[PDB]
Every structure is written in structure tokens, then in C-alpha cells.
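Reopening this ticket.

The earlier resolution said the output was attached, but the attachment link was broken on my side. Pasting everything inline this time so it's all in one place.
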Amino acid sequence: MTLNTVALELVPSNLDLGTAHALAELQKVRKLAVDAGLDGRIRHIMIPGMIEEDDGRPVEMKPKLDVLDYWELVQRELPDVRGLCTQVTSFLGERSLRRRLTALIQHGFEGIAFVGVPRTMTDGEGAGVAPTDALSTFSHLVKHRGVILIPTRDDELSRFGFKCKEGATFGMTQLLYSDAIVNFLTEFSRNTDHRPEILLSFGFVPKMESEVGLIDWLIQDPDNGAVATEQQFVRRLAASEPAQKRAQMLDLYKRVIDGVIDLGFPVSLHFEAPYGVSAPAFETFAAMLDYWAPD
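Inline output:
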């Protein structure tokens, strides 16, 4: 009834590569995992769903394979793993979303995180499905229904509480670059009886971040202040040398693990490499798993 998993995020490959290079890159994924000791320690692959829109990102953003096309390639080169997915619901509508969700579960996906985009209905006439509505409407299709949890966001106790009452099974956190999730989950456990599974997301920060600034842009929240502290932590990680960068990352991981695992929520792990899978990212994931892994 709970995932109790370690999930590695794999963004679908670009549409232009074609299969011969798509599977070649997934074979590098496997060798880098074996080389780092992750083999057999990662149970799920999290495949995020696309935004077609360019959206302001520092990186370039080309068209990607659909979640289902990439998942078939993942199963051939990564035969141990199970499937988790991200699905945007705000642009579809009930009957179309039912067909899409049915196909995802039909093709072997074990859990789906419902993701909403703010959208304007003064115009944009034509209703989509709010992710909180899909949580209850499609509970008979999706057993593991997830939402995005941003602990630094200021109404998040009301927001995440409303999502769990509406039927959310697990919460997948934004990239965690501070221990804010500790105080959030403690207050959430004191104000509610909701005990959803928490997918703690940790993102590897390479030296490139000094120049591109991708992770700084992903976690941005104007005039928050707790996010500002996280943006400073990302910057010092990028400017740090590998030994100190790993130590800083793992101290953050250890504090999050220590302050969360006894609060009553089931805990799972979600590993991201926003710039791309690399051996230094996989060894950081292995170091964190050595301190604590769910089982």
C-alpha cells in the first residue's frame, strides 16, 4: 500500500535522437549505476511529463519523447526497474484524462503524480482537470496518486492538507536544499491526521550551475527568504570542490533523514540530476543511500 522505494528521475530523451542513440544513452545510465554501486538499490524510475512550452529556463529545451514511448525504451535497457510518472491534468478534461491515465497504468506505471499548471478561464474557455479533482475522481484507476509538495511555500500546510483530504497518497517534494521539510512535516503531523508517503527529492549540483544557473531557476520563489537560503546553498555547492560539495550535501541529507523518519510518515527517496545523469551524481546518491535507505 506504500511505495517504500528509491526513485531515480530520468527525463525522456530528445525527440530527434532516435532509438539507436536513445538506448545507447540508457546503457550508459546502467553502467554508471553499476560503477557507483546503485545496481539493485534503485527500485523505480520516475519519468516526468513534458511541458511543451519554453517557459524561461536557462537551458534550451527541445521536444522529448512521450512518457509512454520513453518508458518502453527504459524497460529494455533497465529490466530491473519499475515505473513512476508525472502527469499534467490542467489541460485535458475528464474523459481525455481518464483515457490517458488508463493507458499509463495499462503500460505498467505503478504511480502517477498529478501536476497542475495555473491557467486562466476568463478566456482559455474549456475546462481542464485540477490535480486535486483528479485525486478523487480517478482513485479507482491509480492506486498511488501523488502531488507536488513545496515545504518553503507559504500556505503549504493548508494546501498539502487539502490535497491529502482530497485523496493524495504520496507527496513528492521539490528539490530539498535546506531542512525546511523537517519543520513542515513536524507541524503537518501536529495539525492533521494525514500521514501520506513523502518522496524526498535531492538534486545533484554540478560545477556548471555556477555558469548556467538551472537549479537556481528551478527552485526560485520571489521574496520567500527560506528559498533565498536554499539558493545560497546551491551556489556554494556549485563553487565547492567535490569533496566539500559531497560533504555539504550529505550533511543536509542526514539532517533531513534524522528529523523526518520518526514523524509517522512513510518515507521514500527521489534522486534527480537536473543537468543530466553522471558518475559524480550517482556516487552522491550512493553516499546518501549508505547513510539511510528505505526497507
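Reporter confirms the inline version is readable. The chain is about 40% helix and 15% strand. The chain has one domain: 6-291.
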